[PDB]
DNA sequence: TTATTAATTCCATATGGAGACTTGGTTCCGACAATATTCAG
DNA sequence: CTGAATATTGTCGGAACCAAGTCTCCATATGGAATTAATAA
């Protein structure tokens, strides 16, 4: 971190480094959520697609 | 101060009816012609540019540039992304970068009066990018005439446009849209475009030929202590870089006497063990110092009345003392005849940054003027039989005097990095034959005479192509 | 009355004799200090008391920009951990047995 | 002035100036301090010189 | 006995400071244009 | 069904500024410089 008297900001950190990918991932509950979001989209594109064909 | 007077009315002027007392003074009565931004230039409007993400650009800051108009340009690529560099790429994505039109002069809007005006000449290439705090003023009766027209006279007046208002100076293109420059300048300079162009090209010239081979103050005391000791310039500061120093407790007494075990005074050590391992004139310079003061700080005015002081600032890489003192003192010590510089004298500074600190200076400039010297110094007197002072300064000044009390040096406020006389006491330092000495000073102080000798005459052509754009201005 | 130097009018190195009162004979000690009790000499004793009670383990270096815009003031981390009761008696010996030899080598 | 978080600093006055001579002050006032300073160094000298011919 | 260092108090120097000052130009909130939508009777 | 809505986006204005770079002025023990009563002698 490098803070100041208007904010943080990220720097190279020398002393640890952080994990990004966790050891342990819900990869079913990834994939669901996926899969929800593209369903949504999906469903959004047949009602428009509707609405384009009336 | 002043008493200017002024009259209501005055203050119509403008559209923001203001009335700071800068530019009211700016104002007054007005007989002569009058022009406008319109017979001139013309203020450009911002854009966008479309950068290229396969290429390194260049980038270009308002601190970037300097007072003479010399665009100093980063090297970004789009493919690094670093962390020391992101707020760059950020500021970027933002919107705050343009690309110049090939012959407009930028003028910047933050403090005008540090001549932050720069020129884009139209044959050239290496296009370069500019921060929106620039402001594209791309002229109609040629670049050079407004740029020279601008830069020297012009002055007054840009600077007497700024909004302080409870910060930054900073000037506004519509305010730049209102100066009242006169034709007689334009007249007399457009008169004379065909020969001013000329020598002015080269004067400039001449000044670019002595800036190409214009050295640096500091490199020249690096390469010569590393050309006569034989070692190389690529280790002892990739050695420095490594940092995870590790030793024992047996180790911490050896030559510490104050138990010392900081990881500085341990890297200290270590940096000791490879600047020496083929030197061998190593003396201990206990054996070599006679006496040791401080000097005298007191309260300070900046340019009052009283006995002048000096500051950290006046230690130069080079053994010199800069003798330019602007603190001027009006207390009395009972003993002040005790700390009056005088000629001769070894000043090492003690007091400083991590790096700057350590650096002596030798006082070669006669003065019949006394002179105090601060607390923040510590005057040196060793025997002149086997030190020769001045090559003590230059080493203290070398990487040797660097690398040293970068890592000895004491204090919690790293800040203000303080030596002491035990450090100065227990210091190694190499010390060859008086055959030696004598040659690596010489060396030096020819180099460094002749890198002096051209510092003038760029102030002298600098200097030139305003008296003559002054004088033909005038004429 | 329970400090050793409390009366060296360096009240913060005090925290870290206090330090010694509250480990068990192997108790880890991670302390955030300045760089004036690894540097000064007016710290001494502090340096010798951590080199008699503890077992300096790590030293770290942490930038001026760690405590910042607060305070510019140069800091270390201390990784020491506390000898046991032997420890402590067996440096007490050799000290004993090498100031005996310095004294005698003084005088003469 | 010249402030700073080590205290005042004299500076030129360009806003007033002040008098300086009080031009109210009575004058034997203080001409009792001027005789005062006087009568204790005489008396001072009387004190050693008592004993000087002890 | 005439010394005596080893005990003292008294100032000039030396070390250190949860530092402090100074030149200069950067982030960034916050209005605010220009959207940015209209529904709505 | 004409509308100039509001509703956001994205961008000029502007900051009892304040991040970078680097010079300081002052408390405070010390230690030595003066004693001392000691100290043999």
């Known amino acids: 971190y490098k803070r100041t008297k208007k904010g943080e900001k990220p720097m190279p950190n020398d002393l640890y480094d952080l994990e990004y990918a966790p050891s342990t991932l819900d990869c079913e509950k990834v994939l669901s959520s996926f899969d929800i979001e593209i369903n949504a989209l999906e469903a959004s594109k047949t009602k428009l697609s509707v609405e384009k064909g009336l | ?94 919107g705050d970068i343009f690309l110049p039109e090939r012959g407009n002069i930028l003028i910047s809007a933050i403090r005008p009066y540090l001549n932050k005006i720069v020129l884009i000449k139209e044959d050239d290439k290496t296009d370069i990018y500019f921060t929106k705090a620039f402001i594209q003023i791309k002229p109609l009766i040629n670049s050079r005439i407004l740029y020279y027209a601008l830069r020297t006279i012009f002055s007054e007046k840009i600077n007497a446009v700024s909004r302080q208002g409870k910060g930054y ?43 190409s081979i214009q050295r640096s103050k500091k490199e020249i005391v690096d390469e010569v202590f590393s050309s006569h000791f034989n070692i190389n310039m690529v280790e002892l500061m990739a050695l420095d870089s490594q940092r995870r120093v590790d030793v024992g407790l047996s180790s911490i007494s050896s030559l510490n006497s104050t138990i010392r075990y900081s990881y500085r005074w341990n890297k200290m050590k270590l940096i000791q063990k490879y600047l020496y391992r083929d030197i061998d004139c190593i003396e201990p310079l206990g054996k070599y110092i006679l006496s040791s003061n401080n000097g005298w700080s007191p309260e300070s005015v900046v340019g009052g009345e ?69 607390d923040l110094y510590i005057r040196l007197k060793i025997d002149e039989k086997v030190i020769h002072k001045k090559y003590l300064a230059l080493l203290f000044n070398s990487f040797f005097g660097r690398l040293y009390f970068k890592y000895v040096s004491k204090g919690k406020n790293q800040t203000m990095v303080k030596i002491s006389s035990n450090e100065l006491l227990n210091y190694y330092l190499p010390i060859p034959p008086m055959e030696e000495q004598l040659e690596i000073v010489g060396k030096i102080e020819e180099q460094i005479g002749a890198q002096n000798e051209i510092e003038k005459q760029i102030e002298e052509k600098r200097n030139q192509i305003r008296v003559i754009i002054e004088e033909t201005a005038r004429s | 009355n329970a400090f050793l130097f409390g009366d060296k009018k360096n009240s913060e190195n005090l925290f870290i004799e206090r330090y010694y009162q ?73 000290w004993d047995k090498y100031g005996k030899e310095w004294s005698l080598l003084k005088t003469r």
């Not at chain 2, 005088?342 to 400083?352: K, V």
């Open chain 2, 1 to 94: 101060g002043l008493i200017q007077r002024r009259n209501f009315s005055t203050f119509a002027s403008e559209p923001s009816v203001r009335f700071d007392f800068n530019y009211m003074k700016s104002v007054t009565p007005t007989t002569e012609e009058y022009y406008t931004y319109k017979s001139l230039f013309e203020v450009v409007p911002s854009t966008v540019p479309t950068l290229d993400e396969s290429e390194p650009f260049k980038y270009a800051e308002i601190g970037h540039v300097s007072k003479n108009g010399e665009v100093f340009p980063v090297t970004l690529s789009f493919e690094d992304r670093d962390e020391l560099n992101e707020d760059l790429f950020k500021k970027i994505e933002k």
């Open chain 2, 169 to 211: 100076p900073t000037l506004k293109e519509d305010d730049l849209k209102t100066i009242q420059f006169s034709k007689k300048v334009i007249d007399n300079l457009l008169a004379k475009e065909e020969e001013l162009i000329s020598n002015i090209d080269a004067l400039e010239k001449d000044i670019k030929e002595l800036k």
């Open chain 2, 306 to 374: 009283g006995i002048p002081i000096l500051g950290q600032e006046h230690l130069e890489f080079d053994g010199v003392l800069n003798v330019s003192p602007t603190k001027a003192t009006t207390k009395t010590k009972n003993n002040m005849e005790n700390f009056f510089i005088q000629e001769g004298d070894l000043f090492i500074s003690r007091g400083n940054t991590v790096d700057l600190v350590g650096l002596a200076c030798v006082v070669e400039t006669e003065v019949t003027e006394d002179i105090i010297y601060p």
């Open chain 3, 22 to 94: 509250l480990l068990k004979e192997g108790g880890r000690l991670g302390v955030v200090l300045p760089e004036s009790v690894f540097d000064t000499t007016e710290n001494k004793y502090i340096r010798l008391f951590i080199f008699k009670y503890f077992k300096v383990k790590a030293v770290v270096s942490l930038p001026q920009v760690t405590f910042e815009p607060f305070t510019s003031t140069k800091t270390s981390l201390l990784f020491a951990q506390k000898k046991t009761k032997e420890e402590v008696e067996q440096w007490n010996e050799l």
